[PDB]
Each structure stands twice: as C-alpha cells, then as structure tokens.
A and B are shown apart, each in its own frame.
Chain A
C-alpha cells in the first residue's frame, strides 16, 4: 500500500517509494516519437525525434507527460498506480490550470487512490530537517529562489531565473569553440554536459582566477572523449558556472543567483530575514559545483548587513533533496489526512487541489 513519490524534473524524473531515502528510478524526461520514454529514447537517439515535455519546469506537453508517468509506473516502479497514493512535485509558481490538469490525469488516466502536489523547493527544505529558510533550487531548465516560513512558501518573494544546467552546457559548448573545439550536435551536448559535471567549479574570486588561468597552466585539466581523443580545458572550468552569478555571460539582463537570493530575502518581513539568511539551502544538480557555497556565502555577505549571520547549507545529496523531501512528507502518518482522495476528486473535480 506504500505511497509513491514522483519528482518531475525539467531534465530528469526521480521516482520511488515514500519511506525510502533515495528514488529507485532516475531517468531523462524525454519522449522519442516513433513511442520511447527515458533511457530507451536516449539509447535509440539516431532513429527518434526527442522531445522534453517539461520546458523550464512547467509541463507543456500533456500527451508526452502521460507517456512519462506511464513509463514511471509500469516500466520503472513496476507498480499498479490504482493501488498507491501518489505525491507529485511541481515547480514554484506552477499555474492553477497546470496542477488541475496533472490532478485530472492522475485520477482519470491512472486511477490513483489519492494524490498530493508539493512545491519542489519546500520538499528540499524538509529534507534538511527544516521548515523555515530560503531555497536556491537550480535544475536543468529553471532556477528558483523560494523563501519559506513554517512549512509555507512565500509566493510574493519567489524568484525565477530562466537559466539552469542546460544553459550552462550550451554555454560550455559555445566557449569551448574559443579553444578550436567543436561541439554542436545533441550527442556532443551530452559529452559537454559530462565535462561540465566533472571538471567545472565556481571560483571564489572570478577576476583573480581568470588572471591565474591567463598566466599559467595550473588550472588546466584533461578529458578523454569517447573516441579516445584527449582535450584540454582551462578557464572554461570556472567561466561556465560563473554565468549563474553573471547571467550577462549568456546575454541575459537578469541578476545573478546571489542577487536574486538577497532580493528574495528583502521582499520578506524584517522579522524573518535573520532566519532566511541563516538557512540558505542549495538544492538541484546545478548547485553541485565545487566552491558554489563559499562563493554564495561571500556574495550574500557583501550584500547583507555587516552583522548578519549567513549560513549556506549544501547537502551532499542536494541533487535528490526534492525527492527525499517528498518521501519524508508522504511517509508521515499525520500527512495521511492531507491526500486528496479519489472520492473527493469525483465529488469536487480538479479544483480540489486548491
């Protein structure tokens, strides 16, 4: 009778059982029309047209999303959806009509006994044993700043940055051209994503790091491409994640992740700001870069008042914090009375989720 937990990421789906400390299934959010979903769509790349149903954290293709959910239940988890209550995650600022459509699909298409829709950032804070603090959630297609007070997100102060890991990989492909390297295809994009995850880091002082890379080979690294050709990466190691702090690197006139965190805290009541500043939680794969917490600590310290105590919490499993949070939430007995039941759905309709 175990509850299911499904984190619908813009790049990866994380699915598993509530009560578990990790998802059992982690696969790409892709549909390859003839249909193939996840790993099989990626493996058969050459004969398929790949589509991402979750552009920028928001579900845009419901036919393809049903395929993902079906693949999650039947092929990945090997469960009958009609037997398990299901917690689904949603992006901060997800439209009411969007969660109504996902509630309608859960009950009418998969026939779930019960279902709950939780904000991804809130689950990440729960996974750190907290109910108050500000979450920086940077995934594959979107980045969010979500201030939370006593279990509840503060919607007026939520920041959205349309810049996450996917844009960083495209930027890394772009700046690798400045060394004579050419990565343009979808397959080559995946090689550059691997280089990004293995060799990139955030510099504490960007200008001094650029100056060090300009006068010595000490920051250089080698990378073996699939065909055995070894390439050399230099300042691109830190210039790529630097875009998170300086979005002008990719032509965006948006403020960096440190500015949006500060701006989010400042739109909150003075009385809770000390609690937000001391409980800054990083979540998502795009916060995995070495040095990002130290750089964030320094950037927030320069913006905040001199005596403000700043704390950055970047757990080692922060790539799975949203999923873990959902598993903690759905596994609590006293939450078993918050699920929207199939009975309540038949009587009220998709509006019950609000």
Chain B
C-alpha cells in the first residue's frame, strides 16, 4: 500500500481532492499522449483557471520570452496581459516599475502592440456567474456603459463595458478610470495580428529516460545568428534549420535567444507538443525551454503543476515491483494529469520518477524559499545507485 524505498515513505492518498486547472481538458489529453509516445515526463507550470476558455477557443497567440509582462488573474482582463501591470497578477504588482517597463518595451520595440480589450457575452457571463470574478453589471448614469467591480485581493476597482461592434461581432469594450476619466483598457496584442495575447504553457521540467540520455541533453546557451551560422555545416541542416541560416529574422523569432537555455531534445519536444496541440503559425503555446534551466525561476510561481507521464506509471506496479501506481500517491485527474501542488510534493514526485529510471534536471533556484534544499544532486540520487553502492561496499569490504 505504502511506497517505501530507502528513506522515502509515501502514504496512499486518502480522500482525492479535485484541482481546478486552467489548462483545457483536451490539451491535458494531448500532453498525456505526447508523454506516452515520446516516453518522457512533461511538467507544465500553472495556468489560471479563468484562462481555460481563452486557450480552448484557439483564437489567440500567447506570450513568449519577448513579452515578460505578466498576465492578469482577476477582473475583466483575466487571462490577458494588461499594458498597465497594476492590473496584472500579484507577482507583477509586487515590482510594478519593472513589469511596466517590460510591457512598454515589448510594444515600443515591435514585439507587441497596444490593443483594446473586447469581451464577448459568453466571457462576461462566465466571469460573473462561473468564477464570480466580476460583480453583476449595472447601467451607469450618463457614461452609457455597464459598470462592474473586481477585486485584486487588496482593493476593489470599477470597470465599465461599452457595447461595440468589431468585425460585425457584438462585443463589450473594457473601460476604466484613468485620472477620474473614462479610458479604454489596453492589453498587449500580437505584433502581426494585433490581437490580445494570452498566457503561455511554461514547461516546468521534462524528465527523459536514462537509456535515452545522450549528447542531445546538453543544455546550451542561446547563440546569436552569426555564432550559430559559424558553428554549423549548412549541408547537414534540415530545411527547417536551413531557412534560419538564410533568414536572420526567422532564426531570432523561432530559435536563439527566444528559446532561452535549451537542449536539442527539448527544442524537438517543443515542436512535437506544439504540433500535437494543433498550434502552429503564430498560435504556439510552448515558446521556450523548461524552468529547470531558467536562472530567474520563481519556485512559488511553479505550483500547481500538471505532469504528464508514460502510461506504465498508471499500471498496478508501474513505479516498480511492490511500489504501486502513481495514482496511489499523487492526484491524477480524468485526463491523466498528475497534479503536483507544492515543492515537497514535487520533490517526492521527482524521487519516484528518478527511481523508475527517468532523469531530473535540477535548478538551484528551486531551493529558494525552502526550509531545506530538496533539489540538489545528492538528495535526488537514484535509489538503485544508492542501493548498489551499499551492496558493493559490503561485498568488496569497502
């Protein structure tokens, strides 16, 4: 019943809790299949529940490494990226000056535009009735718009929705008080389509099988278009990489600094995920490398995480003989997503996966704020490695 291996003891989950996730159920299903096909464990950082229908719609592009401004998780701008970061999630409000500069530079540099925020009736009804993120609408005297209120946890701010018709669609344009005067709300839009972008799917980590470890796992620093052209042989490049060698803008938008710290395996798996989601030509959800190689990682912002595992983990002794199944110890939803809620549970999850032959990539930044440094090379050693050393030291007399 209990998972026991050396000093690691896990009790079977008593009463299974249901965790509300922002990732659409259909994307969870795709990732559960990618995990099985590729024989990898894929972890994705949180996505706010209210972003669900925006991602499900498949109408929006999402933010990459050139849009560092945070998305909002409250108000009528929930799921979008406000130009005024005081309307973004708590982490952006904590460093308002830095995140406002991010928002402005992304637009001023051409990697984004300042767009107006339009919401449909379905979205308004969802924010009012489903998530209770917006208070019921009321016609405000003179203004002509529908007043609604929203809280960020500390203060309640009023918002006003004006009925408009864009592309012949009837929508509600979001307005707010800027110096006591009505002003159109601005969100960060895509530099090509001009449409508001949503949050991305940030890979937390990718655990590959030990038998698959090789030169493709070397995490490499981003190279400039010139540094990369000098390092490669043109004839050996596929049509995809030959196009990047022939077009600097194409390399800089799909490769180089835009990926961050990545390995060749991850660049490929990022393509597989994007292709399996049906998200290509500007609408990709995965834009860069995993949080395990992110030097600016914020551990507090990494949970709840959704992990996708190969199907054998779900079998009667998927974690090993007498070790049980992953669902016994971790919350697995209907789509096969293992929901990891905190760093301690992530540490336990990684140890089980390491014991089942899947390799972790540890970020020292994951230990920030922890009572103990769980994510270190020594603490995460494979129990097969530790057990064989105990056996060999005993046999050889060392």
Residues of chain A touching chain B, judged by Cβ–Cβ distance below 8 Å, are 12, 19-22, 25-28, 38-40, 43-47, 126-131, 150-151, 187, 226-228, 288, 315-320, 324, 327-329, 331-335
B398 touches A332 (CB 8 A): yes
A316 touches B395 (CB 8 A): no
Q: How many angstroms from the CA of A107 to the CA of B132 in the assembled complex?
A: 72
A43 touches B215 (CB 8 A): no
A227 touches B238 (CB 8 A): yes
Interface size on B, residues (CB 8 A): 36
* Residues on B with beta carbons closer than 8 Å to the beta carbon of A129: 387-388, 390-392
* Residues on A with beta carbons closer than 8 Å to the beta carbon of B377: 20
Chain B stretch 44-75: residues in CB contact (< 8 A) with chain A: none
Could you say which of A129, A288, A318 has the most chain B C-beta atoms within 10 Å of its C-beta?
A129
Could you say which of B378, B381, B385, B387 has the most chain A C-beta atoms within 10 Å of its C-beta?
B385
4 A-B pairs besides A26-B217, A44-B231, A228-B238 with CB distance below 8 A are: A12-B215, A44-B232, A126-B392, A332-B396
* Binary interface encoding of chain B residues 227-270 relative to chain A, with 1 for a CB under 8 A from any of its CBs, else 0: 00001111110110000000000000000000000000000000
Tell me the smallest distance from the CB of A239 to a CB of chain B, in Å.
22
Given A126-B392, A333-B398, does the pair A328, B385 have CB atoms closer than 8 Å? yes
Tell me the smallest distance from the CB of B26 to a CB of chain A, in Å.
26
* Residues on A with beta carbons closer than 8 Å to the beta carbon of B135: none
Tell me the smallest distance from the CB of B305 to a CB of chain A, in Å.
23
Given A45-B233, A332-B393, does the pair A227, B209 have CB atoms closer than 8 Å? no
**Chain B residue at minimum C-beta to C-beta distance from A190:** B236
Tell me the smallest distance from the CB of B105 to a CB of chain A, in Å.
34
* Residues on B with beta carbons closer than 8 Å to the beta carbon of A331: 389
Tell me the smallest distance from the CB of A237 to a CB of chain B, in Å.
18
Q: How many angstroms from the CA of A41 to the CA of B23 in the assembled complex?
A: 42
B215 touches A26 (CB 8 A): yes
Residue in A28, A151, A187, A328 whose CB lies within 8 Å of B236: A187
Q: How many angstroms from the CA of A22 to the CA of B238 in the assembled complex?
A: 31
Q: How many angstroms from the CA of A327 to the CA of B382 in the assembled complex?
A: 13
A21 touches B381 (CB 8 A): yes
**Chain A residue at minimum C-beta to C-beta distance from B395:** A131
Q: How many angstroms from the CA of A25 to the CA of B234 in the assembled complex?
A: 26
Tell me the smallest distance from the CB of A342 to a CB of chain B, in Å.
22
Tell me the smallest distance from the CB of B292 to a CB of chain A, in Å.
14
**Chain A residue at minimum C-beta to C-beta distance from B390:** A129
* Residues on B with beta carbons closer than 8 Å to the beta carbon of A21: 354, 381-382, 384-385
* Residues on B with beta carbons closer than 8 Å to the beta carbon of A151: 395-396
* Binary interface encoding of chain B residues 350-375 relative to chain A, with 1 for a CB under 8 A from any of its CBs, else 0: 00001001010000000000000000
- Cβ of B180 within 8 Å of any chain A Cβ, yes or no, is no
Given A40-B231, A43-B231, A46-B233, does the pair A128, B211 have CB atoms closer than 8 Å? no
Residue in B210, B378, B381, B398 whose CB lies within 8 Å of A317: B210
* Residues on A with beta carbons closer than 8 Å to the beta carbon of B236: 45-46, 187
Q: How many angstroms from the CA of A128 to the CA of B389 in the assembled complex?
A: 9
B210 touches A328 (CB 8 A): no
* Residues on A with beta carbons closer than 8 Å to the beta carbon of B217: 26
Residues of chain B touching chain A, judged by Cβ–Cβ distance below 8 Å, are 209-211, 213-215, 217-218, 231-236, 238-239, 354, 357, 359, 377-378, 381-382, 384-385, 387-393, 395-398
B211 touches A316 (CB 8 A): yes
**Chain B residue at minimum C-beta to C-beta distance from A14:** B213
* Residues on B with beta carbons closer than 8 Å to the beta carbon of A46: 233-236
* Residues on A with beta carbons closer than 8 Å to the beta carbon of B397: 334
Tell me the smallest distance from the CB of B201 to a CB of chain A, in Å.
25
* Residues on B with beta carbons closer than 8 Å to the beta carbon of A27: 215, 218
Residue in B215, B357, B396 whose CB lies within 8 Å of A28: B215
Given A27-B215, A44-B233, does the pair A328, B389 have CB atoms closer than 8 Å? yes
Residue in B213, B231, B393 whose CB lies within 8 Å of A22: B213
Could you say which of B213, B232, B359, B387 has the most chain A C-beta atoms within 10 Å of its C-beta?
B213
Tell me the smallest distance from the CB of A37 to a CB of chain B, in Å.
13
Tell me the smallest distance from the CB of A47 to a CB of chain B, in Å.
7
* Residues on A with beta carbons closer than 8 Å to the beta carbon of B359: 22
A39 touches B396 (CB 8 A): no
Could you say which of B218, B231, B234, B378 has the most chain A C-beta atoms within 10 Å of its C-beta?
B218
A131 touches B210 (CB 8 A): no
Residue in B213, B234, B393 whose CB lies within 8 Å of A320: B213
Q: How many angstroms from the CA of A226 to the CA of B242 in the assembled complex?
A: 11
* Residues on B with beta carbons closer than 8 Å to the beta carbon of A127: 385, 388
Q: How many angstroms from the CA of A22 to the CA of B398 in the assembled complex?
A: 21
Q: How many angstroms from the CA of A130 to the CA of B391 in the assembled complex?
A: 7
Given A43-B232, A187-B235, does the pair A22, B210 have CB atoms closer than 8 Å? yes
Give me 12 A-to-B residue pairs in the complex whose CB atoms sit less than 8 angstroms apart, sorted by A's number: A21-B384, A22-B359, A39-B218, A129-B388, A131-B392, A288-B211, A315-B384, A317-B211, A319-B210, A319-B211, A324-B388, A332-B392
Could you say which of A128, A324, A328 has the most chain B C-beta atoms within 10 Å of its C-beta?
A328
* Residues on A with beta carbons closer than 8 Å to the beta carbon of B354: 21
B388 touches A43 (CB 8 A): no
Q: How many angstroms from the CA of A328 to the CA of B232 in the assembled complex?
A: 37
**Chain B residue at minimum C-beta to C-beta distance from A331:** B389
Q: How many angstroms from the CA of A329 to the CA of B397 in the assembled complex?
A: 12
Residue in A39, A316, A334 whose CB lies within 8 Å of B357: A316
A19 touches B395 (CB 8 A): no
Q: How many angstroms from the CA of A45 to the CA of B235 in the assembled complex?
A: 10
Q: How many angstroms from the CA of A250 to the CA of B395 in the assembled complex?
A: 41
**Chain A residue at minimum C-beta to C-beta distance from B382:** A21
* Residues on A with beta carbons closer than 8 Å to the beta carbon of B391: 129-130
Tell me the smallest distance from the CB of A85 to a CB of chain B, in Å.
15
B238 touches A226 (CB 8 A): yes
* Residues on A with beta carbons closer than 8 Å to the beta carbon of B398: 332-335
